[PDB]
Design a protein around this motif. Structure first.
Motif, PDB file in Angstrom:
ATOM      1  N   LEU A  13      -7.732  -7.151  -7.246  1.00 45.65           N
ATOM      2  CA  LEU A  13      -6.604  -6.332  -7.744  1.00 45.65           C
ATOM      3  C   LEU A  13      -5.361  -6.590  -6.892  1.00 45.65           C
ATOM      4  N   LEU A  14      -5.554  -6.626  -5.574  1.00 45.95           N
ATOM      5  CA  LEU A  14      -4.467  -6.874  -4.656  1.00 45.95           C
ATOM      6  C   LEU A  14      -4.282  -8.390  -4.558  1.00 45.95           C
ATOM      7  N   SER A  15      -3.052  -8.823  -4.771  1.00 49.85           N
ATOM      8  CA  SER A  15      -2.713 -10.233  -4.770  1.00 49.85           C
ATOM      9  C   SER A  15      -2.873 -10.934  -3.429  1.00 49.85           C
ATOM     10  N   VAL A  16      -3.546 -12.077  -3.464  1.00 50.29           N
ATOM     11  CA  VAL A  16      -3.767 -12.907  -2.286  1.00 50.29           C
ATOM     12  C   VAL A  16      -2.401 -13.402  -1.747  1.00 50.29           C
ATOM     13  N   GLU A  17      -1.499 -13.789  -2.636  1.00 48.41           N
ATOM     14  CA  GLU A  17      -0.199 -14.289  -2.209  1.00 48.41           C
ATOM     15  C   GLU A  17       0.548 -13.177  -1.529  1.00 48.41           C
ATOM     16  N   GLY A  18       0.377 -11.981  -2.059  1.00 45.42           N
ATOM     17  CA  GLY A  18       1.025 -10.832  -1.464  1.00 45.42           C
ATOM     18  C   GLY A  18       0.457 -10.472  -0.098  1.00 45.42           C
ATOM     19  N   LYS A  21       2.045 -12.688   2.571  1.00 47.86           N
ATOM     20  CA  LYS A  21       3.400 -12.252   2.890  1.00 47.86           C
ATOM     21  C   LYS A  21       3.342 -11.001   3.789  1.00 47.86           C
ATOM     22  N   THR A  22       2.488 -10.054   3.405  1.00 43.92           N
ATOM     23  CA  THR A  22       2.321  -8.815   4.168  1.00 43.92           C
ATOM     24  C   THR A  22       1.861  -9.161   5.591  1.00 43.92           C
ATOM     25  N   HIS A  23       0.844 -10.010   5.668  1.00 45.66           N
ATOM     26  CA  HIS A  23       0.317 -10.429   6.953  1.00 45.66           C
ATOM     27  C   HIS A  23       1.390 -11.171   7.775  1.00 45.66           C
ATOM     28  N   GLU A  89      -1.416   0.963  13.151  1.00 47.86           N
ATOM     29  CA  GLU A  89      -0.391   1.720  12.440  1.00 47.86           C
ATOM     30  C   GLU A  89       0.542   0.750  11.785  1.00 47.86           C
ATOM     31  N   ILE A  90       0.855  -0.322  12.503  1.00 45.08           N
ATOM     32  CA  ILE A  90       1.749  -1.349  11.967  1.00 45.08           C
ATOM     33  C   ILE A  90       1.108  -1.982  10.727  1.00 45.08           C
ATOM     34  N   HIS A  91      -0.178  -2.271  10.861  1.00 47.50           N
ATOM     35  CA  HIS A  91      -0.970  -2.910   9.824  1.00 47.50           C
ATOM     36  C   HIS A  91      -0.938  -2.123   8.521  1.00 47.50           C
ATOM     37  N   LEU A  92      -1.079  -0.798   8.618  1.00 48.25           N
ATOM     38  CA  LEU A  92      -1.061   0.047   7.424  1.00 48.25           C
ATOM     39  C   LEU A  92       0.340   0.126   6.827  1.00 48.25           C
ATOM     40  N   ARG A  93       1.317   0.383   7.674  1.00 49.60           N
ATOM     41  CA  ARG A  93       2.708   0.487   7.230  1.00 49.60           C
ATOM     42  C   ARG A  93       3.167  -0.713   6.375  1.00 49.60           C
ATOM     43  N   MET A  94       2.994  -1.932   6.887  1.00 44.16           N
ATOM     44  CA  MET A  94       3.398  -3.144   6.154  1.00 44.16           C
ATOM     45  C   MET A  94       2.693  -3.244   4.796  1.00 44.16           C
ATOM     46  N   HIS A  95       1.409  -2.888   4.775  1.00 43.10           N
ATOM     47  CA  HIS A  95       0.612  -2.970   3.534  1.00 43.10           C
ATOM     48  C   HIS A  95       1.119  -2.070   2.431  1.00 43.10           C
ATOM     49  N   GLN A  96       1.527  -0.875   2.805  1.00 42.90           N
ATOM     50  CA  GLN A  96       2.046   0.070   1.834  1.00 42.90           C
ATOM     51  C   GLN A  96       3.367  -0.422   1.239  1.00 42.90           C
ATOM     52  N   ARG A  97       4.258  -0.936   2.084  1.00 42.44           N
ATOM     53  CA  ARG A  97       5.566  -1.416   1.616  1.00 42.44           C
ATOM     54  C   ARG A  97       5.645  -2.759   0.867  1.00 42.44           C
ATOM     55  N   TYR A  98       4.864  -3.760   1.270  1.00 42.16           N
ATOM     56  CA  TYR A  98       4.939  -5.061   0.614  1.00 42.16           C
ATOM     57  C   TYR A  98       3.751  -5.450  -0.259  1.00 42.16           C
ATOM     58  N   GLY A  99       2.759  -4.586  -0.357  1.00 43.90           N
ATOM     59  CA  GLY A  99       1.620  -4.949  -1.172  1.00 43.90           C
ATOM     60  C   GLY A  99       1.996  -5.112  -2.626  1.00 43.90           C
ATOM     61  N   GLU A 100       1.384  -6.090  -3.279  1.00 42.47           N
ATOM     62  CA  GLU A 100       1.625  -6.268  -4.696  1.00 42.47           C
ATOM     63  C   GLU A 100       0.326  -6.531  -5.408  1.00 42.47           C
ATOM     64  N   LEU A 101       0.176  -5.843  -6.529  1.00 42.32           N
ATOM     65  CA  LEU A 101      -0.995  -5.976  -7.384  1.00 42.32           C
ATOM     66  C   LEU A 101      -0.763  -7.143  -8.326  1.00 42.32           C
ATOM     67  N   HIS A 132      -3.800   3.137   1.433  1.00 42.33           N
ATOM     68  CA  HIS A 132      -3.357   1.891   0.797  1.00 42.33           C
ATOM     69  C   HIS A 132      -3.283   1.978  -0.749  1.00 42.33           C
ATOM     70  N   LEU A 133      -4.307   2.547  -1.384  1.00 44.62           N
ATOM     71  CA  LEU A 133      -4.339   2.642  -2.859  1.00 44.62           C
ATOM     72  C   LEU A 133      -3.262   3.622  -3.317  1.00 44.62           C
ATOM     73  N   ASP A 134      -3.006   4.615  -2.493  1.00 42.72           N
ATOM     74  CA  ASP A 134      -1.965   5.574  -2.840  1.00 42.72           C
ATOM     75  C   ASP A 134      -0.585   4.876  -2.822  1.00 42.72           C
ATOM     76  N   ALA A 135      -0.298   4.103  -1.780  1.00 44.98           N
ATOM     77  CA  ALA A 135       0.991   3.435  -1.710  1.00 44.98           C
ATOM     78  C   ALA A 135       1.169   2.462  -2.863  1.00 44.98           C
TER      79      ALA A 135
END
Length: 230
Positions: A13-18, A21-23, A89-101, A132-135
């Motif tokens: 569901l969560l894009s590998v390309e995304g 970028k997040t990482h 904390e950093i890890h979660l923050r970035m995931h919420q903002r740049y994650g793409e389905l 993460h699913l909420d963001a």
């Protein structure tokens, strides 16, 4: 007849390309002005976490947070930069903002809802996953969400699938599992009698297609398969 459709999360569901970028954003934030190429650090992180997760396949659960922190502390030591204490904390923050389905995810989950039990089965730390699913805005599109932390084992151990089947009130034969790893996902779900659907968007895993019942390159192919089975 199929009464439930279950989905893996990262890579399905969560894009590998995304996540790449997040990482890359996480690495850049971790490094700051330190003279190490963030892409180099990313490449190393991916490889070491991939190898670490590999060792835990099918084994008792250990927080994924702990496994990734271990890797990052090892890399900070290796390259000489300071390990950020709030790394997670950093890890979660970035995931919420740049994650793409993937583009068709919401359409597919919404179409199956109502007709079938729609669930998620994933190797994850539960609390982090919920944030993460909420963001991403999809937490509520599921009838059930089951994690390795709940089951106490990582895929392909049968207990994680058993717990998801019990939460949904269905036998394995009445369920489909959609994932992107032939051995952990298709192999693991098959042990419970489930029907497996491999997501291979770029046709990069043909060498392992024989491990799965069906292969799709787009998630919208999933409802056609279910109707065809029913």
């Amino acid at each position: 007849m199929i009464r439930a459709v279950f989905f893996d999360f990262v890579g399905t569901l969560l894009s590998v390309e995304g996540e790449a970028k997040t990482h890359l954003k996480i690495m850049e934030e971790v490094l700051g002005d330190y003279p190490l190429n963030p892409k180099t650090l990313l490449d190393e992180y991916e490889k070491l976490t991939r190898e670490a997760f590999s060792n835990y396949a099918g084994k008792p659960y250990r927080p994924i947070r702990d496994i990734e922190e271990e890797v990052m502390r090892k890399l900070a030591e290796k390259y000489g930069f300071k390990y950020p204490e709030n790394f997670w904390e950093i890890h979660l923050r970035m995931h919420q903002r740049y994650g793409e389905l993937y583009p068709e995810v919401v359409e597919v989950l919404k179409s199956l809802k109502g007709k079938y039990h729609v669930g998620m089965i994933t190797d994850s730390d539960t609390e982090y996953l919920m944030a993460h699913l909420d963001a991403l805005g999809i937490k509520d599109l599921f009838d059930s969400i089951t994690t390795s932390e709940e089951a106490g084992f990582f895929k392909p151990h049968p207990r994680i699938f058993e717990l998801a089947l019990k939460k949904a009130g269905v036998k394995g034969e009445e369920a489909v599992y959609v994932g992107d790893n032939p051995v952990k996902d298709c192999g693991g779900s098959k042990n419970l009698g489930m029907t497996s659907i491999l997501l291979d968007r770029k046709g990069e895993k043909r060498e392992f297609w024989d491990k799965c019942d069906f292969i799709v390159s787009d998630l919208r192919e999933v409802i056609k398969i279910v109707d065809e089975l029913n």
